[PDB]
């Protein structure tokens, strides 16, 4: 204990003011490892560390206590929180959960994200001064004052250290002043001294009239020495429950002494670890299990504003992504312009202009789908965790994402459409150019919304990408340039009727070839004269609205599991 940093401050700057919270589990029996007759009772001011087999497959024990879980759900016991039966509302109102994987935006500083979480957590009755005071108290409690201005960037970004990231996550989950704190593997992937400091900080937090639960698979000696209460779990059944310093004396009193120069936790874990040998080691754990038993606000508009502000602050600071996007857009524009270069002695023909318009309409959706799927799956887990925490009810989040992605989409459309209409020497004027720009913008927006819906509808990144590519190919073949838009019997015709690429091609044709032929005969011989321009615009708007409705329904009903 003398080898670690000791020049710290043992003061408590942000304590829990209120009635002490309790947590009592009575004969918990989980089914699909095999928790059998779990029972414990902790109060505010104690730090319970669950060592050993603290998991039941894909979900840990703390996920079962909170009511979550990816595996089975059939319970056989009771869970009492603050003297009340377990319920999702109660665990959402009183219990706080700190997952193992952090969910923090890299382009934001500590103070900015803390203020955002405080504004989304504290009610509308608290003034700005109270929110600032709460943020300052949370910063001072976790000793994050020397890094309150530095960014919290993840890997491949400078940001800050891992321990500081864990502290920022704890502060985010602690801004609304919870009564019960729950962390899953807080010292995973951290240094020894960093893990010791984090354990000391968690103990100081638990000392301030709070209840902190910690799950640790293989705790070190210095970490086990700082435990207040410990719970040994081997293959779902409890072996010991009480003080950590008394575990050795209890095991020695029950006839299992700990050898000198050997960690107690690892020894008592591998002594009863399940391996003809499986049944021999199972009764040993069952004998110790039976021996232990005999001896014992603010609103939707405010949330939308906070979300759109956070998204704008995170997007306008990501210079590499914006640079790659602009480079791709400029490369595509230059290729399209110099390939169909109309200035010179030989002018562009009719079929050349048709192919140029079709390519302008159908080449950007690939990169659009790619970028949108990547951006959505890079924060799907964060969105799921923020939705499960109870900040927003995914209503204003849709409009927030839309209006946060709209500026980047408009800039990308400008960059993709500016060096394209003049290099190809298309119809001169302001009205046709503005109409082409608006049509391209609307079509790319519809494709972006389709990509968002496909990302929110399927949980797998590869499956969502495959579905998006299938839809893109179905809309590409249904265009009025490949299969003549006339050789469609029943299915491809209706696919083209809802194909934004076909409508984009028809609109570009009607814009470029109306009364500018070298007349309406060029569209009369073709099949692009049965819908006026405003009708095409209204159809594109209706398709965009339908895709938005589908995306909203998928966000509201389908869980965005990572």
């Amino acid at each position, epitope marked *: 204990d003398r080898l670690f940093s000791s020049e710290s*401050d043992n*003061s*408590l700057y942000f304590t829990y003011s209120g009635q002490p919270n309790t947590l009592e589990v009575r004969d918990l029996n989980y089914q699909v490892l095999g928790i059998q007759n779990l029972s414990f009772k902790v109060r505010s001011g104690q730090m319970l560390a669950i060592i050993g087999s603290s998991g039941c497959g894909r979900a840990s024990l703390l996920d079962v206590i909170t009511g979550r879980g990816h595996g089975g759900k059939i319970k056989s016991g009771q869970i009492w929180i603050n003297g009340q039966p377990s319920s999702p509302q109660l665990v959402r109102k009183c219990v706080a959960h700190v997952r193992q994987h952090n969910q923090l935006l890299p382009n934001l500083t500590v103070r900015e994200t803390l203020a955002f979480i405080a504004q989304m957590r504290l009610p509308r009755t608290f003034s700005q001064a109270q929110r600032d005071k709460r943020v*300052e108290d949370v910063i*001072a409690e976790l000793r994050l*004052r*020397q890094c*309150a201005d530095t960014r919290v960037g993840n890997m491949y970004v400078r940001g800050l250290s891992g321990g500081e990231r864990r502290r920022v996550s704890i502060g985010v989950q602690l801004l609304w002043n919870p009564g019960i704190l729950i962390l899953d593997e807080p010292t995973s992937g951290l240094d020894s001294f960093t893990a010791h400091n984090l354990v000391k900080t968690l103990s100081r937090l638990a000392k301030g009239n709070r209840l902190v639960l910690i799950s640790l698979h293989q705790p070190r000696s210095d970490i086990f020495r700082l435990f207040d209460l410990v719970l040994l779990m081997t293959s779902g059944t409890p072996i010991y429950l009480g003080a950590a310093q008394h575990m050795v004396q209890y095991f020695t009193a029950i006839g299992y002494p700990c050898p000198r120069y050997s960690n107690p936790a690892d020894f008592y874990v591998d002594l009863t670890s399940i391996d003809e040998q499986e049944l021999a080691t199972r009764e040993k754990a069952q004998s110790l299990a039976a021996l232990f038993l005999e001896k014992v606000m603010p609103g939707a508009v405010q949330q939308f504003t906070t979300l759109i502000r956070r998204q704008i602050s995170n997007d306008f600071r990501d210079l590499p992504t914006l640079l790659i996007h602009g480079a791709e857009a400029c490369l595509m524009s230059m290729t399209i312009g110099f390939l169909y270069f109309g200035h010179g002695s030989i002018q562009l023909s009719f079929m050349d202009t048709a192919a140029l318009l079709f390519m302008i309409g159908a080449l950007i959706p690939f990169n659009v789908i790619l970028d949108v799927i990547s951006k959505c799956y890079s924060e799907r887990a964060m969105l799921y965790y923020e939705l499960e925490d109870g900040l927003y009810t995914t209503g204003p989040y849709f409009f927030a994402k839309i209006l946060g992605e709209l500026p980047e989409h408009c800039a990308y459309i400008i960059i993709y459409g500016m060096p394209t209409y003049w290099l190809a020497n298309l119809r001169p004027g302001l009205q046709p150019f503005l109409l082409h720009f608006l049509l391209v913008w609307l079509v790319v927006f519809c494709c972006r919304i389709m990509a968002l819906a496909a990302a929110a509808l399927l949980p797998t990144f590869h499956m969502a990408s495959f579905f998006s590519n299938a839809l893109y190919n179905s809309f590409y073949l249904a265009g009025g340039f490949m299969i003549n838009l006339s050789s469609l019997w029943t299915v491809p015709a209706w696919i083209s009727k809802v194909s934004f690429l076909r409508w984009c091609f028809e609109g570009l044709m009607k814009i470029q070839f109306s009364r500018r032929t070298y007349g309406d005969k060029i569209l009369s011989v073709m099949e692009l004269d049965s819908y006026p321009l405003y009708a095409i615009y209204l159809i594109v708007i209706g398709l965009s609205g339908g895709f938005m409705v589908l995306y909203y329904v998928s966000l509201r009903f389908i869980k965005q599991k990572p």
Partner: antibody, heavy 114, light 105 residues
Framework: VKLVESGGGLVQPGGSLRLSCATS????????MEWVRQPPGKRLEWVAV??????????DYSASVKGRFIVSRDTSQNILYLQMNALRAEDTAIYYC??????????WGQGTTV | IQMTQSPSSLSASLGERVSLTCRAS??????LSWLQQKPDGTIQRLIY???SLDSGVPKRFSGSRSGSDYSLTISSLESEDLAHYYC?????????FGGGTKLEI
């Protein structure tokens, strides 16, 4: 807020002295209590800290006075006490009574010569 | 964290713009306070967090930051400015003070 220091005088080296810091105008049970000294020819130096009721009235001292100084508080009269032992060797200063250190040293007192 | 304050002494006339510089050895993220010790002995905080001002403090005092150098600017100096100034940090334990600056008219 008002801070009044008292208890300064002439003491022999190795003796004992007790300083008194009177508090008025704020809740004595929710704010910290800090002792800050000032040598006649040096900068300000924090001496000790007495936390509020949320920390069970725990105390802490600097690396130079840890073991010789004892700070306490009386909640009945809202008066801070600092028991100094083995003083006058090099601890002669203009000791002041501060309220908060983590939220900026605000509402200083008058200071007394020890 | 050592707080080096410059200059050690400063003399100006009434109405002049005085600027004191305080440098921190580490990063405090703007957690700096400015104290004013009157010749009588009573100290009074003027600027906290290096940007805000306390209650009852005249609007002539202002705080700025240029990189890692915090600056306390006093415009329209009057006769009530003859005192000592100490910059301190409270972002890292323990709380350290500055060398000090004796401002004389």
């Amino acid at each position: 807020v008002k801070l009044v220091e008292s208890g300064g005088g002439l003491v022999q080296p190795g003796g004992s002295l007790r300083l008194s810091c009177a508090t008025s105008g704020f809740t004595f049970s929710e704010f910290f209590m800090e002792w800050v000294r000032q040598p006649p020819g040096k900068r300000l130096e924090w001496v000790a800290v007495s936390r509020n009721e949320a920390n069970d009235y725990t105390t802490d001292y600097s690396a130079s006075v840890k073991g010789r100084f004892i700070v306490s508080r009386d909640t009945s009269q809202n008066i801070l006490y600092l028991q100094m032992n083995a003083l006058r060797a090099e601890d002669t200063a203009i000791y002041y009574c501060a309220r908060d250190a983590w939220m900026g040293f605000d509402y200083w007192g008058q200071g007394t010569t020890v | 964290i050592q707080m080096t304050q410059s200059p050690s002494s400063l003399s100006a006339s009434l109405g002049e713009r005085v600027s004191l510089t305080c440098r921190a050895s580490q990063e405090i993220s703007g957690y700096l306070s400015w104290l004013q010790q009157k010749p009588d002995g009573t100290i009074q905080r003027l600027i906290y967090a290096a940007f805000s001002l306390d209650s009852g403090v005249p609007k002539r005092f202002s705080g700025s930051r240029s990189g890692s150098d915090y600056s306390l600017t006093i415009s329209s100096l009057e006769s009530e400015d003859l005192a000592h100034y100490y910059c301190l940090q409270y972002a890292s334990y323990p709380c350290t003070f500055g060398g000090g600056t004796k401002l004389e008219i």
